[PDB]
Write a protein that binds this ligand. Structure first.
Ligand code: NAG
Ligand code: NAG
Lengths: 52, 48
């Protein structure tokens, strides 16, 4: 965990290393193009406008 | 070591609420009849 800091790790290869610009602040509609967070929890809903 | 898992299911579409059809089992036809009967300028409306 690094905030406003550049940091290094033992394994010099920067490829296998992985970083997140994670914010985890907003809810989104389930879509195939987006990976599922480990929570996999139903947190809210929404309606669909312009019914029949 | 990477692995991917996908799953799929289905549900009735939101518009179904009005586009839905229903399967019916019917039997034992029964009749109801409405009659008008006049006797000596005495009219009567009945249903049976
Ligand atoms: C990162 O989050 C921690 C925990 O909320 C906080 O103490 C720290 O100040 C934050 N650093 C930032 C926002 O640069
Ligand atoms: C029906 O006819 C009789 C005679 O046949 C008469 O006395 C009576 O007033 C009539 N009734 C009506 C509702 O017209």
């Amino acid at each position: 965990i690094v905030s406003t800091r550049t940091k290094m790790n033992g394994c010099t290869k920067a490829k296998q290393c992985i970083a997140y610009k994670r914010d985890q602040t907003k809810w989104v509609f389930n879509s195939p193009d987006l990976i599922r967070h480990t929570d996999h929890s139903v947190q809210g809903k929404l309606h669909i406008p312009f019914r029949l | 070591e990477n692995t991917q898992l996908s799953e799929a299911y289905v549900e009735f579409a939101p518009d179904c609420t009005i586009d839905h059809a229903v399967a019916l089992k019917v039997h034992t036809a029964a009749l109801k009849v409405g009659l008008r009967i006049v006797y000596g300028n005495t009219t009567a409306r009945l249903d049976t």
